[PDB]
């Protein structure tokens, strides 16, 4: 009807909303620090645009709580990462894999620290990082699922690892699942990525006797009105307060049938054309 906006421009206008084009990178890969996503370090946005051509090129992983982490970071509108001086006594830091090339040689996620044995021992790591600031801290960490029992003992000595991450409120323990998954970039192992919000007056405690993928710091969290959107439409220097994955639309009509997902001041969605 004449009251329903049914057509789109097919392009996303970068005025007045600050658009960040993910290109080959998802927000989560930019968060983790996948080497080919290094350009997104400490970037900012009103709307992050994720492309269907985005890919990962680092250690093969899963994220048990992906959607919530993605939404929390997108709503924040920033990737500001603060390095903290963790002391990891008795282990080897900065592990690298050839499935995650950083230049000519092996590498890893830039925001994560792959810890392995030193000498012939992997001690029980026990560290505490308090939040004495006035903002929320987002910690990204993970656990390594080795492919075989031999890989487990070669890396962490202990035959069964454990990652325990706590605050003053509660404690979370993850046990690795040893086993051969389908081959990805030379590896049958996997990493599971987890995350923890630490609020002012709380503390972060990490305890592990093996398989910990350690944090290097925290993301400085903020309450914002930014968002994220999956779209293949090109970014254009035009003007539009309303953005859909199909592209920008005028917001003068009361209703629109272009897309359920919208960002900015937009007409209310209806199905009727």
């Amino acid at each position, epitope marked *: 009807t004449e009251l329903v906006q049914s057509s789109s421009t097919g392009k996303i206008c970068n005025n007045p909303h600050r658009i960040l084009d993910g290109i080959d990178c998802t927000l989560i890969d930019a968060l983790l620090g996948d080497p080919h996503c290094d350009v997104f370090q400490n970037e900012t946005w009103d709307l992050f645009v994720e492309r269907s051509k985005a*890919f990962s090129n680092c250690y093969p992983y*899963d994220v048990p709580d*992906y959607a919530s982490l993605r939404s929390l970071v997108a709503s924040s509108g920033t990737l500001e990462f603060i390095t903290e001086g963790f002391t990891w006594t008795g282990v080897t830091q900065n592990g690298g894999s050839n499935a995650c090339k950083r230049g000519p040689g092996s590498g890893f996620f830039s925001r994560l620290n792959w810890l392995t044995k030193s000498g012939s021992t992997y001690p029980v790591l026990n560290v505490t990082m308090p939040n004495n600031d006035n903002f929320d801290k987002l910690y990204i960490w993970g656990i390594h699922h080795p492919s075989t029992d031999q890989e487990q003992t070669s890396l962490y000595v202990q035959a069964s690892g454990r990652v325990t991450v706590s605050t003053r409120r509660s404690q979370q323990t993850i046990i690795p699942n040893i086993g051969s*998954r*389908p081959w990805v*970039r030379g590896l049958s192992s996997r990493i599971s990525i987890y995350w923890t919000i630490v609020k002012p007056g709380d503390v972060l405690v990490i305890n592990s006797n093996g398989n910990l993928i350690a944090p290097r710091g925290y993301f400085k969290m903020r309450t914002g009105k930014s968002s994220i959107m999956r779209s293949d439409a090109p970014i254009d220097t035009c003007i539009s307060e309303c953005i859909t994955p199909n592209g920008s639309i005028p917001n003068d009509k009361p209703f629109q049938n272009v897309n359920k997902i919208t960002y900015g001041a937009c007409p209310k969605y209806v199905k009727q054309n």
Partner: antibody
Amino acid sequence: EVQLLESGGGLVQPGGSLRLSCAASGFTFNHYAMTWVRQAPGKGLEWVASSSGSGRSTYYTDSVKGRFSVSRDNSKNTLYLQMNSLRAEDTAVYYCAKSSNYYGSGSYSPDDYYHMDVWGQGTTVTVSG
Amino acid sequence: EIVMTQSPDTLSVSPGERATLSCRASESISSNLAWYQQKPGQVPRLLIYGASTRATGVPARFTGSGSGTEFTLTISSLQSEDFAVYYCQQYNNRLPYTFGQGTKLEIKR
């Protein structure tokens, strides 16, 4: 609703080629591994090929290696199966199937292969002289 | 090559009676095992994953158990809709998927 719509099956001479298509809707396509399953007349289900969420990792059963090729266009939410040098033993109904998640909704496992959530309606290819 | 073997090939049981189907893996697949049901001229449908977890919408009379190399799927009381071919399947153990050869659940009379 999650839907998988298949097309491209048909009759082909031995040694011929066919391309199967699986158009997906109702879910975030690139988050899930997608795979091809075939069933010969009066026989059991057989895994053919699988593709990761990104498509950068592919796997094949031994009997189709070097002849079949799985791909996906994540901009079109479509899975493909290019079948070259077809043989009579390739006559079967071909299903595409979506991997389920493991941790529940809102999780992300594009490089793992879990119990199959949704199946296409099937497309028949017949290789004969 | 992990081999999934189902037994028996055909299981004959009266409507309303109990039925138990078995599936064995040539090596341990932990609990990465699913059961599917297929009627003639029909798409397969998921029944059990994780060896023992009923899929959404699957009636309570279906139950699975086992871990490692031996698995059982039990139907406590068969209804007309339950007579079909059942397939077990490993997933994510080095190869993405491997099916058992299937067991036909047939009406005994």
